[PDB]
Amino acid sequence: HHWGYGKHNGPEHWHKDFPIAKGERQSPVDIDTHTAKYDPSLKPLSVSYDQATSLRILNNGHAFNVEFDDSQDKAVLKGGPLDGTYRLIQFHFHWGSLDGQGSEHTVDKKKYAAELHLVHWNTKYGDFGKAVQQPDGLAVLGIFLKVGSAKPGLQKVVDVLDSIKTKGKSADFTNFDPRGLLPESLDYWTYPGSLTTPPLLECVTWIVLKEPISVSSEQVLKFRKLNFNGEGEPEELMVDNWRPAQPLKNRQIKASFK
Numbered sequence: 001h002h003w004g005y006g007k008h009n010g011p012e013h014w015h016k017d018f019p020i021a022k023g024e025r026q027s028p029v030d031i032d033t034h035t036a037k038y039d040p041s042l043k044p045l046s047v048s049y050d051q052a053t054s055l056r057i058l059n060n061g062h063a064f065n066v067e068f069d070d071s072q073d074k075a076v077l078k079g080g081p082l083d084g085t086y087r088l089i090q091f092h093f094h095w096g097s098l099d100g101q102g103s104e105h106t107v108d109k110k111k112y113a114a115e116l117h118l119v120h121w122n123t124k125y126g127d128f129g130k131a132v133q134q135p136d137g138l139a140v141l142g143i144f145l146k147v148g149s150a151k152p153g154l155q156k157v158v159d160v161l162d163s164i165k166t167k168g169k170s171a172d173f174t175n176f177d178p179r180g181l182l183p184e185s186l187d188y189w190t191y192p193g194s195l196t197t198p199p200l201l202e203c204v205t206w207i208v209l210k211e212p213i214s215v216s217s218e219q220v221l222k223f224r225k226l227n228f229n230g231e232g233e234p235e236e237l238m239v240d241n242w243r244p245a246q247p248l249k250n251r252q253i254k255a256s257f258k
C-alpha cells in the first residue's frame with residue numbers, strides 16, 4: 001500500500017503515513033487574486049538556464065521527471081523572494097484526465113489543464129537531501145498549462161514518453177533546453193509552502209507565474225498515455241496526479257505586480 005492518487009491510497013489518505021499532510025504550510029493552495037498583496041520590495045526573478053545540462057527522463061510511478069546535472073552552478077534561479085542561488089535539479093508536471101483539471105494550484109478557483117514544476121535547491125546546503133530539511137531549502141517555479149496552440153519547446157519531451165511508459169523506465173535525454181517552457185512574462189505570486197507529494201516537507205518557497213503557457217490537445221493527450229504501473233502489471237493510466245488545494249492558514253500570498 002504505497003501512496004498514490006487512487007481511491008484507496010490518494011491524497012486524503014496521505015496523512016496516515018505522513019502526518020505533516022495536515023501541517024501549517026502545505027501546498028498547493030488557491031491563489032485569491034484580490035487578497036494577494038502587491039509587494040514592491042520583491043525583485044524580478046533571474047532565471048539563468050543558458051548552461052543547463054539535462055541528463056535523463058524517468059517515469060517514477062507518480063510523474064515523469066527530467067533530471068539535470070546539479071553538480072555545479074549551470075542552471076540557477078535567483079532574485080525574486082529568494083536569498084542565494086538555487087540550482088535546478090529536475091522538472092515534472094501534474095495533469096488531469098480531462099482538460100478542465102490537472103493543475104495543483106488554482107487561481108480564483110480556476111483549474112488549468114496541467115502544472116509544470118521546476119525544482120531547485122539552495123546551494124548553501126550542499127546537496128538536495130540536506131536542502132529538503134530546511135525551511136528555505138527549495139524553490140519551485142510553477143507554470144500553468146492551458147490547452148490551445150502547441151508549444152514547440154515541449155515536443156521533444158512528448159516524443160520520448162513512449163520509451164518510459166511504465167514505472168521505473170528511464171531514457172537518456174540530453175541537450176534539452178528548459179527555456180523553451182517559460183512564458184513571456186515572469187510576473188509571479190509567491191508564498192511559503194511544501195512539496196506536494198510525500199514526504200510533503202515544508203521546505204519550499206513557491207514562485208507561481210501568472211502567465212500560463214499553451215500546449216495543444218495532442219501534446220497533453222500523450223501525457224495521459226503513460227502508466228502508474230510497472231511493466232507487466234495491470235495497466236493504470238497516469239492521470240489526475242495532482243493534490244487538491246490545502247488550507248492557507250496563517251500565510252500571505254504576495255504578488256510581484258499590481
Ligand SMILES: [Cl-]
Nearest residue numbers: 060062065197
Ligand atoms: Cl520526486
Ligand SMILES: [Zn+2]
Nearest residue numbers: 092094117196
Ligand atoms: Zn510537482
